[PDB]
């Protein structure tokens, strides 16, 4: 898990998991990271979910204006010049989402933590 990988982590307790870049290894289990919103800080490993694109049918939840909770499935990876868009599909419908926007609750990021723990 070494430096420049994009990654999922969650940064606060029972915080979600956001879309992050690895930037530094701090050492002690601890990686320092640089969020896609421009935030950074360590964040313990155990809390890096060391995977780009997130996969195929995992269960994610899709940010959008004043939507914080709407969860659906990762249908689609889909790269428009230089950046990436998730297809997600929820109640049999799909809509795209920037990879800022797919986050994963507490509960849907554990999912994918034996997988690509770290």
């Given at each position: 898990s070494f430096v420049g990988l994009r990654v999922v982590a969650k940064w606060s307790s029972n915080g979600y998991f956001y879309s992050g870049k690895?930037?530094?290894?701090?050492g002690a289990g601890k990686y320092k990271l640089l969020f896609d919103d421009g935030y950074e800080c360590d964040v313990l490993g155990?809390?890096?979910?060391?995977?780009?694109?997130?996969?195929?049918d995992t269960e994610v939840t899709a940010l959008s204006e004043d939507e914080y909770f709407s969860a659906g499935v990762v249908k689609g990876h889909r790269k428009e010049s230089g950046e990436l868009y998730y297809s997600i599909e929820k109640e049999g419908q799909r809509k795209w989402y920037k990879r800022m926007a797919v986050i994963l609750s507490l509960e849907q990021g554990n999912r994918l933590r034996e997988q690509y723990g770290l």
């Open positions: 690895i930037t530094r290894d701090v155990k809390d890096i979910l060391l995977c780009d694109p997130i996969p195929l």
